[PDB]
Amino acid sequence: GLSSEQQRAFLAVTQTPHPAHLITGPAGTGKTTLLYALQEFYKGRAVTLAPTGTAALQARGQTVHSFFRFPARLLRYRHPEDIRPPGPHSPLRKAIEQMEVLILDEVGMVRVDLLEAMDWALRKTRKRLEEPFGGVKVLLLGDTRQLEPVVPGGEEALYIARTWGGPFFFQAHVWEEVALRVHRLWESQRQREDPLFAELLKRLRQGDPQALETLNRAAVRPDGGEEPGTLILTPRRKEADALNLKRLEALPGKPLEYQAQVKGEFAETDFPTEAALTLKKGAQVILLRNDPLGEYFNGDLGWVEDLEAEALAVRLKRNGRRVVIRPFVWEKIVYTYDSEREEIKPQVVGTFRQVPVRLAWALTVHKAQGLTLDKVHLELGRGLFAHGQLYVALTRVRRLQDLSLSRPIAPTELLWRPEVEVFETRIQEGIWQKSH
Incomplete structure (x- = not known):
C-alpha cells in the first residue's frame, strides 16, 4: 500500500x-x-x-x-x-x-x-x-x-x-x-505551475541583482494584507503571536481555553503546539495532524465555528466544512534494547495531549516549513539576512501572483552560502564526493 x-x-x-x-x-x-x-x-x-x-x-x-x-x-x-x-x-x-x-x-x-x-x-x-x-x-x-x-x-x-x-x-x-x-x-x-517562479528563486539564490529588481517591481506592497485568504509570515516566533492575539481578541465571540495533559517527560522546548490554546468562534486555525479517518490533513487551514470542552468544529478552506477535531496524545520516544529477539525495540517516555490547532492568522516561517499555502504576506523587521530566511519564505507558495511583502528586500538577504551552491549543483549527479 x-x-x-x-x-x-x-x-x-x-x-x-x-x-x-x-x-x-x-x-x-x-x-x-x-x-x-x-x-x-x-x-x-x-x-x-x-x-x-x-x-x-x-x-x-x-x-x-x-x-x-x-x-x-x-x-x-x-x-x-x-x-x-x-x-x-x-x-x-x-x-x-x-x-x-x-x-x-x-x-x-x-x-x-x-x-x-x-x-x-x-x-x-x-x-x-x-x-x-x-x-x-x-x-x-x-x-x-x-x-x-x-x-x-x-x-x-x-x-x-x-x-x-x-x-x-x-x-x-x-x-x-x-x-x-x-x-x-x-x-x-513541485513545480509545474510557474517554472519562471522557480527560475526567479534560482536567480536570487545565485545573487543576480536585476532579478531582485524585478522581484521588487512585482511584490512591493503596503504593510497589512487587506485581501481575503492572506497568511502573514514572520522570521521569528515572538512577533507573529502578538499579531495573532490582536486578531483573536477583536472577535465577537466567547473564548474557550483548552488543556494540556502530559503523562511523562516532555520538555517545554519540544512542545509541538501551544500548551494554553485559547480559541474563539470564527478563529482562523491550521490543522497539525493527519486524520486517521482520511477527512483532513496535517496543514490546510480553516475556521472554528463551535468550541466545547473536548470538541470544536472547523470549516476547511480546501474542501468546505468537513470536520470535528479529535484531540491527540503523542509520542515522546527514547530507544532501549529489550530482549524480544536481541533487537530494536522502542519505548515511550512521555505524552502530550491536546486538540491540534495553532492560531494561523500569522505563522512563523519555521513552523510553516514543509507546507504549501494559498496567499502570503511577508512582514519584515528590515534585515537579519546573512544567508537569510529569504529562499524559504518565498518558496512557501507556488506562483509569483500572491506574494505581498513590505520592505523591498536587499540582495545581501537573498543569497545562498557558496559552499551550499557547490554542493547543490554537484548532487544533481546522484552521488557526491568531497573534493580532496
Missing part, C-alpha cells in the same frame, strides 16, 4: 549494500509517509534520530544527543573526552551492536561536528575503526533548503572553521571515505 513515486525511491535505497543515501524533497506531508514506510519496514534493524527535539517528535524518533549521550557543547573531531562509548555490557552498546540502519531526519539542521561525533561513536563502539560507521547503513533525509545550523562565535567558531571550514553536515570528513548516494524526489507537486 505504497504511493506511486515513493516506492521507486524506497526500493532504490533498500537494495544496494551501499551504506549512505540522502533523500531530498520539499518536506512534511507526502514526504513523511515514506519515512513511516521505512521505519515500519526496518522494524528489526533501524534507529530513527534527529538533531533537535522538535524534529525528533515529528519523525517518531529520539534526538541524537539524548541517544548517544553527547554533551551540549562543541563536539571536537574524534575527541575521546567529548565522544565517550558506553561501558561494556551496556544497553547503549547493545543498541549500537544490533542496529544496521540509522535514519537521520532533517539532516540540514545537523551540524558537521554532530555527524563526525556520530561517526566516531559508531566506530569506537562497534570496533570497526577502518570502515565508516562500522559498516552501518546511514539513511539521511533532508533537503538543501532548511539550512543552516548555529555556530555562536569565538574560538568555538574558529574550531569549526579550522577543522572543517564550514558548519554544514556535508563537510564531515566521512564523505572522503563514502560516496553519498543521492535520491531527490522533489515531486510532491
